[PDB]
Amino acid sequence: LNLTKEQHEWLNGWLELWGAWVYSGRLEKRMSSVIAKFMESVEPGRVMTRPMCNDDDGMLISQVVDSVMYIDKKAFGILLSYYAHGSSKHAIASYYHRVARPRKMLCRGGGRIQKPSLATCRREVDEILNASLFMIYPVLDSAFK
DNA sequence: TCATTGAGCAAATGAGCAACACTATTCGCATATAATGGGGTTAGTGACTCTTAAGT
């Protein structure tokens, strides 16, 4: 399943506020290590094109996201690539198509070990994004309420 | 009762379109002292034929 429409836009807006918060570099580096090794591949003098949230609410959003997404680094990397840096979904899917190993395909390759197409790459990064938001949402209500 | 044939079906993947937004290319236009007629061959062909033209 997935979320409803109002919950999707609410979580999307809160995550881009949180992404504009971490994009300045105001996250303390001892708190987590995956954002620490994500934010080292970007210049320190970044520009601010998005509205930025305040300190402790962004601290609350950062602590809940690395408490629920501390088991995997790939889906968390997609999340920081879409929301923190601000890259679009199509660029993420194009780079994942240009990198990923040959996989077994069903109902179109007949089991042939081949590279994934761009359409299934867009579909799997959309599924990864929707699954990460479904892991974010009820634990975020548990942190808020 | 079960293997075999006849028919179909949800799902995953590959292809692609439609409208829109940003951006790297490309083209039209403007330079206000005065500026005012060009290079570059082929040079020890031979023989024959067809047409044009001055000469008789």
The distance (Å) linking the CA of A29 with the C1' of B12 is 41
Q: Give the separation between CA A78 and CA A91, rounded to whole angstroms.
A: 11
Q: Give the separation between CA A19 and CA A85, rounded to whole angstroms.
A: 7
Method: cryo-EM
What's the per-residue H, E or C state across chain A?
A: CCCCHHHHHHHHHHHHHHHHHHHCCCCCCCCCCHHHHHCCCCCCCCCCCCCCCCHHHHHHHHHHHHHHCCCCCHHHHHHHHHHHCCCCHHHHHHHHHCCCCCEECCCCCCCCEECCCHHHHHHHHHHHHHHHHHHHHHHHHHHHC
Q: Which residues of A47-70 are buried (b: 16+ CB within 10 A; e: fewer)?
A: eeeeeebeeeebbebbebbbebbe
Q: Give the separation between CA A21 and CA A54, rounded to whole angstroms.
A: 8
The distance (Å) linking the CA of A112 with the C1' of B4 is 29
Nucleotide nearest to A127 (CA to C1'): B12
C-alpha separations of A64 from A68, A78, A83, A138 in Å: 6, 17, 16, 11
Task: Tell me the resolution in Å.
Answer: 3.5
**Residues touching nucleic chain B (CB < 7 Å):** A 105-109, 114, 116-120, 122-124
Nucleotide nearest to A123 (CA to C1'): B13
The distance (Å) linking the CA of A88 with the C1' of B26 is 29
